[PDB]
Each structure stands twice: as C-alpha cells, then as structure tokens.
Amino acid sequence: AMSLENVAFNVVNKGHFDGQQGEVPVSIINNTVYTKVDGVDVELFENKTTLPVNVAFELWAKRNIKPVPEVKILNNLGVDIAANTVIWDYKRDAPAHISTIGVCSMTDIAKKPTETICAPLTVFFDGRVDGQVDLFRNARNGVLITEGSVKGLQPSVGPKQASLNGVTLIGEAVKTQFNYYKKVDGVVQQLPETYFTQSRNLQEFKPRSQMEIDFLELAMDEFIERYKLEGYAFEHIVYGDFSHSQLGGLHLLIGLAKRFKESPFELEDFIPMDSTVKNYFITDAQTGSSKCVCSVIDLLLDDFVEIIKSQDLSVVSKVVKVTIDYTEISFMLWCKDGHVETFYPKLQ
Amino acid sequence: AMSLENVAFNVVNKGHFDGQQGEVPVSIINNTVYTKVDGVDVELFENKTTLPVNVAFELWAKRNIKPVPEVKILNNLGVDIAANTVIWDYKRDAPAHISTIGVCSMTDIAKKPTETICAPLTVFFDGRVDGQVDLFRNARNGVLITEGSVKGLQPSVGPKQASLNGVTLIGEAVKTQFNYYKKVDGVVQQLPETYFTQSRNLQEFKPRSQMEIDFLELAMDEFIERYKLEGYAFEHIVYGDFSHSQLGGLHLLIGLAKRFKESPFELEDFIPMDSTVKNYFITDAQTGSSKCVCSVIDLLLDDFVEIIKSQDLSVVSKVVKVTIDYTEISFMLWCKDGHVETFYPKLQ
Amino acid sequence: AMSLENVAFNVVNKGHFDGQQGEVPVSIINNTVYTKVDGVDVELFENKTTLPVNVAFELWAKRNIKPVPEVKILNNLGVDIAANTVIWDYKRDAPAHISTIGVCSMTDIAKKPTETICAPLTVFFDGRVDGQVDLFRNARNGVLITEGSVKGLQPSVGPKQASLNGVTLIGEAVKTQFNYYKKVDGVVQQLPETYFTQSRNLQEFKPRSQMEIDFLELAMDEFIERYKLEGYAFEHIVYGDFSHSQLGGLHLLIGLAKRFKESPFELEDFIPMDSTVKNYFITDAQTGSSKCVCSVIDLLLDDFVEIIKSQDLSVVSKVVKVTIDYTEISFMLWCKDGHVETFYPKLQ
Amino acid sequence: AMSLENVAFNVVNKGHFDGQQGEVPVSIINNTVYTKVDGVDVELFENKTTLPVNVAFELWAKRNIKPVPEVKILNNLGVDIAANTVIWDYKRDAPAHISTIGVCSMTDIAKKPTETICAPLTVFFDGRVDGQVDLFRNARNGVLITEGSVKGLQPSVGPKQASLNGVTLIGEAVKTQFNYYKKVDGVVQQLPETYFTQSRNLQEFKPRSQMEIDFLELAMDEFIERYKLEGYAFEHIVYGDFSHSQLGGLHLLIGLAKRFKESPFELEDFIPMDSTVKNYFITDAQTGSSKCVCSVIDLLLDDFVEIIKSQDLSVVSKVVKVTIDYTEISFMLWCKDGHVETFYPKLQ
Amino acid sequence: AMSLENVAFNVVNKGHFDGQQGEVPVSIINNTVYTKVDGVDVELFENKTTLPVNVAFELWAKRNIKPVPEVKILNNLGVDIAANTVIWDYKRDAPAHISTIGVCSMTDIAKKPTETICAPLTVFFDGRVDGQVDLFRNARNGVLITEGSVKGLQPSVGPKQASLNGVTLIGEAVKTQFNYYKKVDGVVQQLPETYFTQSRNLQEFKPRSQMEIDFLELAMDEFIERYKLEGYAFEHIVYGDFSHSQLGGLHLLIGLAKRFKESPFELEDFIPMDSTVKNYFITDAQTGSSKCVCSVIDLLLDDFVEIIKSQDLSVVSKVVKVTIDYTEISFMLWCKDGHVETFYPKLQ
Numbered sequence A, B, C, D, E: 001a002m003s004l005e006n007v008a009f010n011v012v013n014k015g016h017f018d019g020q021q022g023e024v025p026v027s028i029i030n031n032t033v034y035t036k037v038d039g040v041d042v043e044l045f046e047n048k049t050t051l052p053v054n055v056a057f058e059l060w061a062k063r064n065i066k067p068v069p070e071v072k073i074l075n076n077l078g079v080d081i082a083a084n085t086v087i088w089d090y091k092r093d094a095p096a097h098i099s100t101i102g103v104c105s106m107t108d109i110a111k112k113p114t115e116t117i118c119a120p121l122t123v124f125f126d127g128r129v130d131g132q133v134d135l136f137r138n139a140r141n142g143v144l145i146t147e148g149s150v151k152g153l154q155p156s157v158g159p160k161q162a163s164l165n166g167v168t169l170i171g172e173a174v175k176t177q178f179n180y181y182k183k184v185d186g187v188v189q190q191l192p193e194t195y196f197t198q199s200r201n202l203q204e205f206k207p208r209s210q211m212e213i214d215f216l217e218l219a220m221d222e223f224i225e226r227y228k229l230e231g232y233a234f235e236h237i238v239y240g241d242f243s244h245s246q247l248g249g250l251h252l253l254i255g256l257a258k259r260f261k262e263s264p265f266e267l268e269d270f271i272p273m274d275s276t277v278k279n280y281f282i283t284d285a286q287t288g289s290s291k292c293v294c295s296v297i298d299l300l301l302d303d304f305v306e307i308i309k310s311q312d313l314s315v316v317s318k319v320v321k322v323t324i325d326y327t328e329i330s331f332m333l334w335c336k337d338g339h340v341e342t343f344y345p346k347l348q
C-alpha cells in the first residue's frame, strides 16, 4: 500500500523509507515536497532530478543506506539498473539509474530481476541481501558485490572505499571493500587487473603513503631527487606550471592539494558527475594561469609513479592505456630525447 | 489511510473519490496530476487553484456530486465552510471555501462541525445527509438546506435551480429547490423576502414566462406597447443602445440573449467568479459600440418589471436597494420629468 | 504612484487601467495574477507572454481600448513602438511591441516620443489623442493615423476595419477607417497604392460584394461562367481540389468558407500571429485530402479577380508582386498554354 | 498605500520595510523578485515558502529586525500568530506563522489583535512596542515578552539568547533575555520551571562552563573520573560509540562538537526546522558508523549531568520527563544493576 | 549553424563555447539544461537570469574567458553592451548587459558594432581582439581597453586587477591592468583622476601596504598614534562601534576584516551586484549591534587616510565628492570643534 503520505511519514519518523505504516500531510509545490509541522510547512525534499517530484522523493527515501560501490565503479562496470534498491547518486542529487526493479510503481520495469525485461540489462546485485547471489547466477547480465567468497566464482577485490549516504569512506565499523563479479550474455566475465582512484577531496586531502607525505612536505626539487623522478616531467604533470596564460599540467589531485595549501583556485566542474577522470575549467587565483579542460585523476602518487616509470620513453607520441576503476583510461604520452615532456589523461 | 495514489485510484475507477481501496501510480509535474496507463502518462487533473497541486486534486476528487446551492447563494448567505463535503466552484475551478471539515488532512480545521473552531464560522449543512439537520440545530452559526420541512423551523424557499457537477439546472429527476435556514450566534434568523437570479446562459437562453417569450419574439416597440412600459427606458436598459461609441444600457441577460441571436459580441469576464450581478467589458461586433464595465443581472423579465414599476420616479438620481439571492443589490436609478433615463445594478 | 495592487484595483473596478486610485490584495503564482474576493482567490490574468507576469499584467491592463489598426498593418508599416499606449496583440495574447513610451516603468525606453532614443524608431501616433499629430510632425520616424484631414499632408485611406478589444470590425458606432501617414528620416512618405485584406473569420464569414454573394450561392461551374473566369484555375485556386492526397489550391478565405458550410476541416495555425498571408496545415475531414503549408489570404473576391486578370499568362513560372496591407506580397503564378495552372501567395 | 513596488523600494533603500514612500520597478519570475539596476535585473528575493512570491516578499521585508524569541520557544509556548509584526523563521526561510495581524493584506486575518478572530489564537505580544502589554491583558490567548516587570504579572525569566536577523546571540549592545508571560482561555498561566537549550553550532561551538571546558580538553576517562560520572554511560550517551555499524548514543551537542574537532561526519537534517530536540541521520566519516534517527539536544553539560544524576537507577526502563524550553521532553532511561545503560530524548 | 545541441557539445567537450562542431542530446526542464551521459541526465546549467533558459545557457557558454574589467568598472563607465563577446556577471550569475552584438540570435541587436543601432549605445571594445581599436575609433559611443598604447589616444591607467572567470586577481601569468578609453557622442572623453577599490573579500583579506599590515596587527590606539590619526574618528569610521543597538561606523572593508578575525557577523547583501560602494544589513554576532544600511568600501587604507586628511574640518556637515573607480562617490563629512565625528559613503 505505497503512497506519497506513507513515504513522507517514513522520512519524518525513520529518516528514510523503512516500510513503516503511517501517513503525514504532504504538499507538493513546484519541485518541493513539504509536510505540515505545527501549522507550518517544512521542506522534506527538493527535486534536483528530471523525474516528477513525487517520484524522485520516493526513490530518494528508498535509497540504499548501506555502504555501496561509488557510482563511478558501477558505471565503469556497465551497471544499468539495481535489483530491489536505489543507488542514490549524491554528486548529481539523483538516482544513479533511470529505472528500478521492485522499488517504485512509476519507475519499475519489473518487480523481480528474474523478469525477461531485465535479461539484457546489467543488473546490480548485493550479496549482503538474501537471495541476490542466486539471482546473479540466474541473471543474463549483472554485477555482484559480496563481503566474502561465492563457491566457484573467481573474485575481483574492489576498492577499499565505498559510499555510505554520500560519504566516501574506508570502513572501520562497516565493510566497504567488496568482491566484484560481472556477467555479460550469461557468461561470467573475468574482471581485469586494475588500479583504483582514491576518491579524496581537495579541501580534506590526506596522504596515504610515505611518498605522498614526502610530496606534500618536501620542496619540488628534493622530492624529485629523493624518488629519482628526473626526466619524468613531474614539475609539469604533478606540480603544475603557472608561468604562462595556459596552466601547464596539473593532472594529479595530490598536486592540486599541495597548490591549494599555498594559494586558492577555482575548479569549474562543467560535467558534474562521479567519474574516474574529472575535467575542470581551472583558474589559478594567484597568477591568473588557467585551462578550459584540465583532466584530473586521484591516483595514489606511488601508483602514478609506477605507471609513468613503466613507460617506454623512445617515441614522440603514443596512447598509453591503463586500467583504473575497472575501466580503460587512455593517457597521452609525449617524449623527447628519452625524457617525458607530458603525460595526461587523454581528452576524448 | 488517505493518500494521493488512493485518491487517483478513486478518480480513475469511480469518476471521483468514493472511499474505495486501491492505488494507481501517479506523477506530479508542475501543476498537473498524471497516472500511468499502459506505459504512458494520462492527465487526471490540472490545478487552476492557489492551493498545492496534490491538495487541490484531493478536494476536487472529494467534491459534492449532488445538486448543491450555487456558490453565489452560499456567499450571499455568508457561508465560510461546509460540513464534511467540498463545494467545488466550477466558475473559478477551485474549492468555494478555503478550509474543510472532515475532508482532507491538509485543509481540515476540524473533523466534525461540533469542534469549537467551527463555532464562529457559518458552516453549511445539508439536510439530505444524516445528522446534519441536528448539527445545524446545535451550531452557533450555519446555513441549512433541506428538501422538506424541519420541525419548529420556518423555511425560506430557495431558488428553483441548483448546481449539479457545474451544471446549473432545475431538477426533474432530482430535487434542486431547497428550503434555506440560517443561524447567527445561536439565533434562527428570519431570512428576508428575496428575488432570485435565473442563472441562465447567453448561448442556451430559454424564456421562463409569457412576458419573456413575448420579449424574444416581438419587436421592441410592440413589446413595450403590449406591456405598458412607455417611460421606463427599456429601449436603453434592456434592449441596449448600440448607436454611440459607449454601449448604452444592456443590463438584463434576456436583452443580451435577444441581441446575441442577431449579432455576436465579446463579453470579457474580468472578475471570473459566481455573483448575483456580473460585470463585463462588452464589445458589440456589429457596431463597435463598447462599455468597460457593463453590469448584467439575470432576472426574470417580470421580476425586473416589478422592481422598476415599484420605484418613485421623481428624483434625478438615487440608490435603489433590492434583495436578490438573499443579498442587498444596490441599483442606480436616474430619472428626468417623471420618466426613467437609466436603471442599472451598481454592484460588481 | 504605479503599483501592481493599483493596476489590479483598476482591472477589478474599471475593467482595465483607468488611472483610478486604490489597491486590491494580489497574489502571483507562476504566471497568473489573482485577487482576493471574500476570502478566495479569483484569477485576473494569465500570462501568455515572454515578459515577467506582473509586467505583462500591467501592459494588458494599459492596452488601447479604442479601435486601433490591426497588428498586421502596423507591422507592414514598420511600426516599432507606440506613443503613450499599448497595442495589445490579441492573436498572440501579448503586447504588439517590445517596449513602451510613457506606459510602464519596466518596459519604457522614454516617457515622451520626443526623447532622442525614439528618433530612429518608427513610433505609432494616434491623431485622436491631443498633440499626437504635432508629435508626428516633429518626429523623425513614425506612422500617424487620423479620422480626418491633416494640414498639408496627403492621406492614404486605410482599411475599413480596425481592431476594438480584439474584435476586428467595420465601425458603425465608432470610426474604424483611418487616414495613414508615414515619415522616414524626417521625410513624409508617399504610401503606395494597396489592396487590403478583409480580416474575416471562417465561422462568421459574410460576403462584401455581389460577386462574393454569387460565389457562395452559385455552383462552381455557373459562377465561373457568369464571371468569365474560364482558364483562370478558380476550380483549383479558390474552390480547392480534394481529390488527391495533397489538397490542391484553396488559397482564398472565401473558398475555405464555402467548403466549411458543407464539411469541416482542421486548420493548424503553426505560426499564430496576425499577418497579411496566413499559413495553415490543413486536413479536410470529409476526404482526408491535406497540405502541410496552405497559404491563405482573405482578399475580396473582386480584388483577387482583378489581380489574376491583370497578369501575363505566357510564362511557365514567375513571381507576381502585389501591394497588400502596404506590404509587398509575392505570389507564385504557374501557367501552361495561356491558361493559369495555379496562383498562390508564396508568403508566410 | 501598500504595494509591491513600495516594498521593493524599501528593501533597496532601507534594507527592509521601513514605511518609506517610493517605488522601484519590479519583475517577478517564477519564485524570484527582481529589480532593475542600470538596465539589468538584480535579485531581491527568492521565495522558499509555500506562499505566493509577492506575498512572501512582503512578509520577509516586514520581518521583525529586533532580537526576538527563537522559533523553538514560540512553538513550545503554542504561539499561532504575532501581533502587528512578522517573526521570520530563518531555519525554514519562511514566516514562523501562517497568518498575520495588521501586516499584509493577503495574509491578515485582522488589523488589530482585539478583533474576535484572534481570541481563540495564541497571539504573540512584544512589550517593547507601545500598547502591546495592554493588548495581552485584553487577549483571550497570548504570549507576552517584556524587558522589565509588568505590575501584577508573575514573570518567567526566559533564555539568555534571542534571534536578531537570524543570528542567535546573547546580547551585549541589546537586551535578549526577556520575561515571558502566557494566557490560555483568558487566564494567565504559570510557566513551568525549565532548563534552556544553548542554541550553539557544531562548527563554532564554545564551552559555557568549567565542566564544558574540561569535557572538550580532557580525555574521556579522566573527565568521567573528575566529575564522578562512573555508571552514568557518558561513554555511550555523550562521547558516542563508533565501534559498530549502528552509531551508539551521541545525543548531546557538546559530544558531537568534541568528535567534530577530530574527524568529520554528515548530519542529515531531514526535518529542517528549529526545535528543542533535533533529529539527524548521522554518518561518521572516519568509521562508517551511522544512525538514521539520532536525537541531539544542546543542553549545557552541567544541566545534563544534573538531570541524569537526579534519576533513580533501580528500574529497567522508564520515561523521564524534563522541562526544556518550556516544553515537556520525554527521555528514555535504561538501567541495569544500578548503572545507566542509555538515556536519550525519546523518539516519538 | 548555431544550435542548443552545439552549444552543449562545446560546453561538455571544451569547457565553454569554442566554435567546435558537434551535437550532444539536451533536455530542458524548467530552468535547467541537462545532457545525457551513460543513460542519465547531468546538469550543465541552472538559469539564474530573467532570460529564457536556452538563451542564458548560450550567453554563459559564450562568456569572455580572458581577464576582463570588473562589472563595477564597466557600469561606472556607462557600458551598455559589449562588442562580439559576453561579459558574464558572476556576482549576479547573469550577463552584465541585456543585449549582445554578434553573439546570440535571440539577444543580438546587431552582428557588428558598426550598425546604426549601436551608435547611441556605449559599446565595450577589447583592444586584444583584432580590429576592435578601429571599431572604437569609428563608434559614436564606447569604452576601449588595451594592453599598450594607441597612437594619439590619451590613456587612463585602470585598476591592477581584473576578473578572470569570476576570479578577481592581479595577473602574473596574464595582464590584468588595462589602459581605458571612453567616447561620448563621437568625442573621446578625458577620464578623471581616480582612486580604485581593491576588490578584496572579508574571508581571504590580505593587507597591500605597511599601513594595512599595522592596522591588522597593532591595537586601535597605537595604530592611530603611529599614523597621527587623532581627531579623524577612525575609532568610529574604520574600527566600528559595537556598544549601542545601532552599529557605529564600520565603512572600510579592512575594519570589517579586523573584526571578522575576532568575532563573526552577518552581512546581508540586499542588492547583490558588483558596485564601488556596497550596502549591507550587518548584525554583529558577539554584541547584537546592528545597522540596516551599512555602506562599505574597500579602499587601500592609505588611500582612505589620504582622502580624510585632505578634508577641511571647519564645517558641521558637507558632501565630499571623491572619484573612485571612475565614478563620483559622495561622502558625508560631519565635524565638531575641528575634529571628525563621522565620514561615510552617503546613502543616496
């Protein structure tokens, strides 16, 4: 007996949809859901989605409140829809997927992932919910996450971090590192060996290795000396060049974090969504050095050093493909006289 | 267990709210309520009110579908709120009253009219619903309608016509002529002697007397001759004067109906609401004769003749007060040399 | 002391803005202006313009309520702005001009047309308002209308009809036929010889000549015989050909009116604005004969006969230019063996 | 002579409504009020209320700009409406009350609180405005605030802090501590002995006692030792338990402030309004420990210590009612073997 | 071949409009432009302007991404429109000018500034774009900026700072200090000698002189002693008086910055636009001292000291006009016994 007033009752009393019985008075005006409290309207939800306000309200209330894979991972794995849950995309303030399965009568394409409409779609399954590992085994297409082993299925160890209510974290009181499994056309697919992005923020950036501590503490020339990075263009790629009108390099988040401590800069997120590589229109406030499309990736500095040091530096220009977050990231490598000139996530 | 989905289910299956159990998927977008039918959205309701879309939807679904007094009568009698029903105002496409009693959780000020919040409000009671005659008997303020006699209380015979789903009609299969009772501060009022407006349309106008048949059939001069109306300015007041830039007279609906048969005209309803006297910005299409504020009343021609023939014609200008639909309508009477110059509802 | 509440007071009490003092409570919700009447909101105005709701409300309230030239005439004469009035475009439900002069503080570019900002704009002047003939005399660019003669200036007799509150009519109680004058860069122009469109409706079409009476009364072959129209393709151009999937001809409003009496058809007005030539996507309901772009002109049948009879019929295809409503209308004339095949307004 | 353009003139020139004469051009688009400045539109107000945009604009402009009681206090005292002022609710960005008295023609239920419509409503009166103490004496229901004594009326000393333009502060240049008086059904009511919440922020939290300084400075075990809190579950209730998936305790704002200094966390305010007890969906970013409904109260630590130490610890579970901000706050007390297990504001 | 889908393609791929060929799917809902990415809608733009959403999207995409004069300077110089660029006003989130020249088909009044419609408008020209210095020489009205000298034109050295993508900065990698030129009615105008505002923020305020360092570091009485400011009311004007209900003075941004370090305060920007002098409704959080209209200017402290010390202190009250940002700023000077009482930017 699903209703707008019951979803609102659950939000008000339980903090989210919790299957509880009850109704609260609701008013919908434009794109906002309000509830009456002591004679006045109190805002419960502001629709930022392209779905109808009451529909987006129910999907948000029905969001998964357990640690779930970050939307960039689900996207990189080709996930189309989730089985009997809503993965809320906090970066877009919208459902991560267009349709649902057994969640909301307006967006449901099926009540169970076993329905034939779900066979061509890559359904996300959560091994923490009863019966979902079995539903993945019977699914034609799907991605499964588990906390432990599944007899016969070869696991892929995912990232350490997961998203819990929009907070990306490495769990201590909860498990956030999952085993990942994928099936394409009824066949279990081998997930590739991959690096993982660290999902850190510029404002609250923390080093996760002795190399990262040394990058943030040491001066540019002594860090490059200590880590034998001469001829790898870290001065351009990681530290950044703010001497010309066009900002040079600055493609690693740790380099932006180091700069941010000394002077501020504007990062225009012109495609605001979760992705392995992010594109920003950057304007350095100290110098006025700027770049319309500055691709940034948050790799652990050691992982980036390992990628660039593994490269052959004998050709003028080549596409270097690196698996990051299960996806193929093309990098552009420019060399001269056996030294790196630039190395950046190739702007497609 | 009131809900948006249940109100929508009732509209789709029963044509209105009928207390039936069930839910249909609903989407709200801007001011419209849609329901999904075979994968596509079908419009159920377009909000024309100043209330939230979902709230207006429920009050419209919960509208009274029996013949009810026309909103102009309820307003003239000082009705503030209705007891356990919604009087839908079809002229405004909105509820006739701001609040409800035992109807909708968002608009309810009380569940029963016996609650102390209803004591100072003139509550509308319908003697056709069980226990409402007794709720009026106990009420401090109220208006009661009945189909027959009430013990001890003397009735005021109302108009022949009532509104059934927005259709104003004189019932043949249903009773539309009610007895009216009114209480102010616990005292049963003596409702005054009143004329009633006829609530006719210009396009489907029907005469309701031999004088009205003769007005529409005969020529102007022979009707005035037959009914001894010389000196009463019917040529100006009722027939209308389209010879000058400002349209002269034309204050009786029957006169507009007669004109409408010969040539069309635009009637701008600049305050669209139900009222005893209506104001229109009229433009006669044949002549180009026009008037910004042309007050029109739909009185039976015989009743209008009685009013104008019962006035003293010895003063240049005076206010003539007439009880019409229980309200005091002021008219402006202009005379010269013992004859009428003009007579018009000075009301809005 | 202009205000929203004062404009609303004027609309409610005077039927339009009349400079009266007073205020009524107003509420604005989305694109609608409401006013409170006995505790409930009554709609005063629904904004159909691309201007802000309160601004469009004031321009509509301040609309010219005298017979004014039809917007197609003002446009054809290059009118940019009106002097101290608003020409309301009833076909678009919007002001005919972007800006105003001495009308509304939000849209005013000047308070008087003598301000230098108005010098390059063709200002519309109304000789019926005191001092406007003299403001046109001093203006660099302008269009003047008068009811009589102007000293020294030679007139161009305009169309018989004018628009009074959106009703196009030939005045009997008011004058609708104006003298037109135009100045370009300080020089009084000689307005060209022009035909005028008749501005009739399909539903209320009336013949304005003995030829038009004969077209509507007689059969196709006897009308063409009586008026010696053999070889002029009136069967195709005026009567219409509904025998093939593509509707043939039907470019004169009188021909659509004749057809409309026998059987209905849909006319999709895909560019809804006032213009000399109109384009309709027509679907004949009886036959299913249709045409995406069917250009229709409302010319007096005698004027259309004069145009087609004054053309050289010796070339396969050529452009025929005709001054209609002061503008140059291009027609496409197609001939074969000295007879007309088709003739149609190539205009939009 | 109230108007939209006059309210806007006052906002632009005086920073709020100040009864000044004048008008500025205004445009309303969707839910925003703009004014023209140097040819471009400048936003004056964005409507976040469920009232029409122009109406909410006027109530916001007419907001009380003197220190006023925090909305949680007015609500806890049953205040329905204010006398001749608007208490703006900055937490909701909306008027604290639905209707007004002598403020705005659209929301006014009366011009003076002496009107009979105000008798059943608890009207807020401000003794700092001339004649309001007398109006409270004549009011059937009301709440009065004063800066000093009222002859014969027994005062209740309110909180030290008040809200001045949305800034909660303890006044040094202005008086913020008021005497409070309440009347129910014509009878002056004795306000109960009460504790007061401190109205502090997590980000700018300041200790207001030596115990609060010691809580934030000392380690958990030495604070509990110093203040003899062994057996009172401060480790769970105040410090918080982040070791399991469900976050344990954390019901006192000072405990959240201490945690906030070490590591961040998300507090989802799912019912955003001012209240004595707040409910948050909390997610600890360091551990991933979370709780859907975590009730938080900002009491001075000494006051909380006094409440819990006053409890009988001999029963398994009991409801403990404490008067806070004039309202009865139910707490849930869970004991075992003469020691506290948990003590929290009971989730209703 | 301009289109919505091409503008969106440019935003997604180039970070702004870059004349590139291509189309991406777009959806417009209410005031937001979305693009489809991996089956879900991603927000590209939220319209905060009074222009249609698709039109504002194109003007924002077509914004000037080079360092440009701050909107306060362009306004103070009477700039109406820009030549073949869009100056985006980041403080209003809207175009700085109503119309464009050769930018967008919906807002263009002309394709080239040489068109006669641009002659009466003060067109902004950028000497960094080819042919714009010549277009300024031929323009009747205009403002020109250059990086170097223009043969024969007497330059005005502008402010050190410019706006690059909404970041006000003094360029190190780019030039931000321009030469300014103005023409009124075909005649090159001599720009006056002027002081410049510093365009600093309260939160990230940095001193730009030894006097400014001493103001922020030293105590009030020793700074006034060191700089011989006795009798100049710096205690009131610059430091601020928070002892009474009305906040005294506090008209220099550096004084607000010094206060901000010790205690917070709310600054209500009730007219949010870029201007030489700003007006704020300020509420000091520590004391509750407040002022509805507190005019603030960010002059370099030395420049302010120079202005006030240059004043004659022998009259009770006088208007003192100072040229700041090319505009005449009226100050109010109040003296008594040869000493300053107050000196503030006169509230108009």
Ligand SMILES: c1ncc2c(n1)NCC2
Pocket (backbone or CB within 6 Å): A334, A341, A342
């Ligand atoms: C594209 N981006 C950067 C570089 C390049 N091409 N050649 C050397 C450096």
Ligand SMILES: c1ncc2c(n1)NCC2
Pocket (backbone or CB within 6 Å): B334, B341, B342
């Ligand atoms: C106003 N209205 C109508 C009339 C009048 N004044 N004098 C004669 C008739």
Ligand SMILES: c1ncc2c(n1)NCC2
Pocket (backbone or CB within 6 Å): C334, C341, C342
């Ligand atoms: C285009 N439209 C009409 C016609 C034509 N081409 N050829 C003969 C008649």
Ligand SMILES: c1ncc2c(n1)NCC2
Pocket (backbone or CB within 6 Å): D334, D341, D342
């Ligand atoms: C509800 N909440 C917490 C507890 C309880 N019941 N029993 C002991 C601890």
Ligand SMILES: c1ncc2c(n1)NCC2
Pocket (backbone or CB within 6 Å): E334, E341, E342
């Ligand atoms: C206006 N504002 C401040 C002052 C004044 N007038 N006289 C002395 C001080």
